[PDB]
Structure 1
Amino acid sequence: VINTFDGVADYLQTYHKLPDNYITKSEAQALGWVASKGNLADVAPGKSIGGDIFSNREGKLPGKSGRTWREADINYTSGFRNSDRILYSSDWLIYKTTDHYQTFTKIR
């Protein structure tokens, strides 16, 4: 599975989509994921949460007209979700956060 910062980042700028081991929160819930039980690995073996829109409410990521942000979980294997996320834009800027969206740094 591809779920590292560098692996997913180089996958996106290239194929312009997430690798196939990713599903959105919606898909996950429908399959039986209950966040409070940390059961993702049991109901969707080998998948990670990713692809949902990221608001960028706190305006910490650079905006521009027509630019939308999306997020994906990084380094996930099982249990409860961790605090690592990749943030990617419609024009393919890539940022990372390891502190639950508090701070961000550019990686592509």
Structure 2
Amino acid sequence: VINTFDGVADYLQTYHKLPDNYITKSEAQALGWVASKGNLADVAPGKSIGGDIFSNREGKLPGKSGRTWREADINYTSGFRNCDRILYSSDWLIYKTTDCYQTFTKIR
């Protein structure tokens, strides 16, 4: 499993998709993931949440017409999700957050 900021960042720029250990929230939900119980590791062992569209509502990430932002969890192993996320755009800009989307800094 590739779940580090560098690991995932390098993977995305080359293969243009997340590593296989990622599943979207709806996917996770379909497998019986219950957010309030922090049971992801139980229902989807070795998987992390990733690949969902990130709105960029507050315009904190560089916008563009036709640019889509997606996110993925970083450093997750089990229990409740953390506040680590990687943010990647359709034109492969990569940003990070370690505070639940409060602040972003470029990594690629």
TM-score by length of 1: 1.00
1:68 aligns with 68
1:104 aligns with 104
**What secondary structure, in the 3-state scheme, does the structure 1 residue paired with 2:12 have?**
helix
Q: How far apart, CA to CA, are the structure 1 residues paired with 2:58 and 2:100?
A: 13
Q: How far apart, CA to CA, are the structure 2 residues paired with 1:26 and 1:44?
A: 13
Q: How far apart, CA to CA, are the structure 2 residues paired with 1:13 and 1:89?
A: 10
Structure 1 runs (4+) deviating above 6 angstroms are none
**What secondary structure, in the 3-state scheme, does the structure 1 residue paired with 2:72 have?**
strand
Deviation, structure 1 residue 24: 0.1
**What secondary structure, in the 3-state scheme, does the structure 1 residue paired with 2:18 have?**
coil
Alignment root-mean-square deviation, CA: 0.2
Aligned residues: 108
Deviation, structure 1 residue 86: 0.0
**What secondary structure, in the 3-state scheme, does the structure 1 residue paired with 2:88 have?**
strand
Structure 1 unaligned runs (5+)? Answer: none
Deviation, structure 1 residue 85: 0.1
Deviation, structure 1 residue 42: 0.1
Deviation, structure 1 residue 93: 0.0
Q: How far apart, CA to CA, are the structure 2 residues paired with 1:45 and 1:100?
A: 23
**What secondary structure, in the 3-state scheme, does the structure 2 residue paired with 1:62 have?**
coil
Deviation, structure 1 residue 88: 0.1
**What secondary structure, in the 3-state scheme, does the structure 1 residue paired with 2:52 have?**
strand
Deviation, structure 1 residue 84: 0.1
**What secondary structure, in the 3-state scheme, does the structure 2 residue paired with 1:70 have?**
strand
Q: How far apart, CA to CA, are the structure 2 residues paired with 1:60 and 1:107?
A: 15
Deviation, structure 1 residue 48: 0.2
Deviation, structure 1 residue 50: 0.1
Deviation, structure 1 residue 87: 0.1
Find out whether 1:59 has 2:59 as its counterpart: yes
